[PDB]
Amino acid sequence: ELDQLRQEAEQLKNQIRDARKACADATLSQITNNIDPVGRIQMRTRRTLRGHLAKIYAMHWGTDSRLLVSASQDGKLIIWDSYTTNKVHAIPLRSSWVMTCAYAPSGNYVACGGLDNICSIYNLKTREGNVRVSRELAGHTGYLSCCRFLDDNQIVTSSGDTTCALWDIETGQQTTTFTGHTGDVMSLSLAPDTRLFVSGACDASAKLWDVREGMCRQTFTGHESDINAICFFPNGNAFATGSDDATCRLFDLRADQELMTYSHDNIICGITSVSFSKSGRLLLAGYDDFNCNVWDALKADRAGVLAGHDNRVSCLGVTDDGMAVATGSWDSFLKIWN
Amino acid sequence: TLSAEDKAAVERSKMIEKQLQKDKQVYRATHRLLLLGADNSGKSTIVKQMRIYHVVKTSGIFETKFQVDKVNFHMFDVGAQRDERRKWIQCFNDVTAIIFVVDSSDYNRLQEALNDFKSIWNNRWLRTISVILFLNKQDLLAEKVLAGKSKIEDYFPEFARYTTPEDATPEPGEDPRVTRAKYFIRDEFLRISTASGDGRHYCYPHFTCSVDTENARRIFNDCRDIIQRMHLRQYELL
């Protein structure tokens, strides 16, 4: 019966909440208070990357920690040489409303997507001197909000319709589909072993997915509004979410709970980009208040601020060796920090 | 200092910057428009007529080019997006204007249209963006009022005390009852607009039909007014 099914679902949710409460004996802050604080963090702008016409929605670091791809609403992907601020490539797009971009771990391809509902993949290393579209992936009904490369042939995309999809690139057909969300899916983050990934949606819930199995292993419901950004701790057993309720949150897959919330009374704007450091001690979060903040992931106190942008920060990414942090905003400027 | 290959790389970057400068010249000279409306609202007919007169299975956006007096316009309407709008609407906060096409001859889904227009107007990212609303299907409205089969006072009781504004200007000249009804609808929309306008953005009403060929001219004039007020704000004139 439908009523019996609803009652069973409610009872099982209550049991899950009770189990989560029982498994929690001491909060992360109460245990971590006995570690010396990192103190004030002094980070300054080293380079500024001019050239994007319009506001920037997307940015992804290279695996070589020197190349950088950026996507802006004017309809361009620019590959910057971060050390010299030179432009390596200028990729014009068919759809100007691009609001996600990824850089392949090998460095041979870049992906992008947006309101066109298509995830386009470009071949950086061709026999010709130009960059050309490798393949265009179709099948999502809503706008594509995030894309991440597993390898040179597998990509994972999240879309406006309540569905994530795993794609084969050689054959345009979707290898696997991920359903279960009830709102727009906004952000996505692959595991260090590229076996699991999370999706943050507009249902204020984050789901831990299984790439091969194709099923939602876990669900995290702690936020009060839609989730805008999400990323794993470098350990690979935890992730952090930034939402419109002006609070960041750290979830743990193994505990299947919420560890800390990074919130302040003065901040009221919602976070739009989240990224950790290499040790995971710094949680850098972009905000709508024109400035990016730096949080201590172990004490939940705001260690520093990266404030140099003339409009809200949309994208944020920390390089693989941890030597720098790139920050992109709607003022059409990328800033390299150290 | 730096090697000869680095000179050649810097020259390549300079060439890329030259291409970006030409692209900037093209980009700055074009005004972007976001088309909005319900299914019954004849925005599809409007965009088809504009495409005919002036200038893919699950695609999420439809792009339309039209040019009036050597001024470029791109008008975008979303095709495959869900009923939710609060997320992908943030991409359209730098457009010149939002064209909200509304059906005024329905009398049943019109309150839903007012709610949608109120949500668009009060959006935190859609501020300082002037909205051009097209009160579409005027001939259907006149026919339905003259027929008398359906009335408006039942859906909106405030119509009973409503009287025709002194500024009403029916150009062709017809029954004052249809003029009173259409100006009542327009005044409801303008009341929603002026409730929280705060002077940051304006609202441009138009009694139009999807068959009308003057819609492009109306959009051009409204966009010229919007750009004029933006330039007056930018050039420290007010």
């Epitope: 010709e128 | 730096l2 050649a8």
Partner: single-chain antibody, 229 residues
Framework: VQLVESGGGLVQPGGSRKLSCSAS????????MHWVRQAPEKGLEWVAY????????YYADTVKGRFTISRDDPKNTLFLQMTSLRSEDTAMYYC??????????????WGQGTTLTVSASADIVMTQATSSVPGESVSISCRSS???????????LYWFLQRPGQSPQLLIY???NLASGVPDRFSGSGSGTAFTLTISRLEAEDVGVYYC?????????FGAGTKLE
């Protein structure tokens, strides 16, 4: 991708001739191009270089005023205009393609070449070993007058393998990076002044002449090279 060049013939001394290089199959405008010649019995010698967009044109010290180089991007062709053709110009002029960005591989493709016959300073001199050296391993070595290591960290050392037949094809750029299409057997080594190219398993197709090249500063000196038989 391909580079076809023509315009080679017997020329009386003191005359003028124009070499053309027709390119097809790649983005011509994004590639800077070079002219590299070899005498019939000598090694390769760099001639000229024109950059992408014609913003940077270089010439060798021996060809500084006699030759001029120009490109036609709409026509997708490259020209070399020759003036005052002396007797020391009888060589095999090659048309070379090169691009420059972070991680690019310059000199990656070469044309077929043209044969020209004429009737009767403080630069990094690159010196090779003796030009006389299946299944074995060979360790062709080279030496540089000046250190090729730059403050950037890239040592601009290039390896070219010319078969007894067709034109040279790039093997290793910047002493460590195997070019596209080259088998994994080839490897490059060095320390800043002396460099060694190693083939881990000789084959029948590895026979030919190995030329080295430097790109730290113009002119692009090559060296005599070594022969494998």
């Amino acid at each position: 991708v391909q580079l076809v060049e023509s315009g080679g013939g017997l020329v009386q001394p003191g005359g003028s001739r124009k070499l053309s290089c027709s390119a097809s199959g790649f983005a011509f405008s994004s590639f800077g191009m070079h002219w590299v010649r070899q005498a019939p019995e000598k090694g390769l010698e760099w001639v000229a270089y024109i950059s992408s967009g014609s913003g940077t044109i270089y010439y060798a010290d021996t060809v500084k005023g006699r030759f001029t180089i120009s490109r036609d991007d709409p026509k997708n062709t490259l020209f070399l205009q020759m003036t005052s053709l002396r007797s020391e110009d009888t060589a095999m002029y090659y048309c070379v393609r090169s691009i420059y960005y972070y991680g690019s591989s310059p000199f990656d493709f070469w044309g077929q070449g043209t044969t020209l016959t004429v009737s009767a300073s403080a630069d990094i001199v690159m010196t090779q070993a003796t030009s006389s050296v299946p299944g074995e391993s060979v360790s062709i070595s080279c030496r540089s007058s000046k250190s090729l290591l730059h403050s950037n960290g890239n040592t601009y050392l290039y390896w070219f393998l010319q078969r007894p037949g067709q034109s040279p094809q790039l093997l290793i750029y910047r002493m460590s990076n195997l070019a596209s299409g080259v088998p994994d057997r080839f490897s490059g080594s060095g320390s800043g002044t002396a460099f060694t190219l190693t083939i881990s398993r000789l084959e029948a197709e590895d026979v030919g002449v190995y030329y080295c090249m430097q790109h730290l500063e113009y002119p692009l000196t090559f060296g005599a090279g070594t022969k494998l038989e």
